[PDB]
């Protein structure tokens, strides 16, 4: 029904353990495409991360496996994303690689600044269900999110 994103993709953490659509397997994930010098969205956009994150564990006591995919692999290596990421919630991981397997991961969800727009939902077995805009604020975010994960049952 909703567009087929999502499939194989192969990249490093920030620490440099290796990150393929196979650890998006066992639990929900929300993935964010954007880059470290991208002005007002990207930052916009990780602090409402941020607040859903603890609004979702505290309330709820739903975990999600958050991630930050760059777009821009020339300038966010690790240790940059490590920097940029240490002013947002610490849960969040980011996700980096050479051009080509970038350009892949991108490719895969159909994705600079005017299109890092959407969260991304994935299933623990590692489907997309759902993609979060800009019209969903600190509230609605959660509940769009509550709903799916305590609806969720496996194959």
């Given at each position: 029904?909703?567009?087929?994103l999502?499939?194989?993709?192969?990249?490093?953490?920030?620490?440099?353990?290796?990150?393929?659509?196979?650890?998006?397997?066992?639990?929900?994930?929300?993935?964010?495409?954007?880059?470290?010098?991208?002005?007002?969205?990207?930052?916009?956009?990780?602090?409402?991360?941020?607040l859903?994150?603890?609004?979702?564990?505290?309330?709820?006591?739903?975990?999600?496996?958050?991630?930050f995919?760059?777009?821009?692999?020339?300038?966010?290596?690790?240790?940059?994303?490590?920097?940029?990421?240490?002013?947002?919630?610490?849960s969040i991981?980011?996700?980096?690689?050479?051009?080509?397997?970038?350009?892949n991961?991108?490719?895969?969800?159909?994705?600079?600044?005017?299109?890092?727009?959407?969260?991304?939902?994935?299933?623990?077995?590692?489907?997309?269900?759902?993609?979060?805009?800009?019209?969903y604020?600190?509230?609605?975010?959660?509940?769009?999110?509550?709903?799916?994960?305590?609806?969720?049952?496996?194959?």
């Amino acid at each position: 029904g909703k567009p087929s994103l999502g499939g194989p993709f192969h990249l490093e953490d920030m620490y440099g353990n290796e990150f393929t659509e196979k650890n998006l397997l066992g639990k929900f994930s929300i993935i964010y495409f954007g880059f470290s010098n991208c002005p007002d969205i990207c930052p916009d956009e990780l602090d409402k991360l941020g607040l859903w994150l603890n609004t979702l564990s505290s309330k709820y006591g739903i975990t999600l496996q958050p991630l930050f995919i760059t777009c821009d692999p020339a300038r966010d290596s690790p240790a940059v994303l490590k920097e940029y990421l240490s002013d947002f919630h610490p849960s969040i991981l980011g996700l980096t690689g050479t051009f080509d397997e970038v350009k892949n991961a991108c490719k895969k969800y159909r994705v600079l600044v005017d299109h890092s727009i959407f969260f991304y939902l994935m299933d623990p077995e590692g489907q997309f269900v759902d993609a979060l805009g800009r019209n969903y604020d600190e509230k609605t975010g959660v509940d769009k999110i509550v709903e799916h994960v305590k609806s969720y049952v496996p194959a």
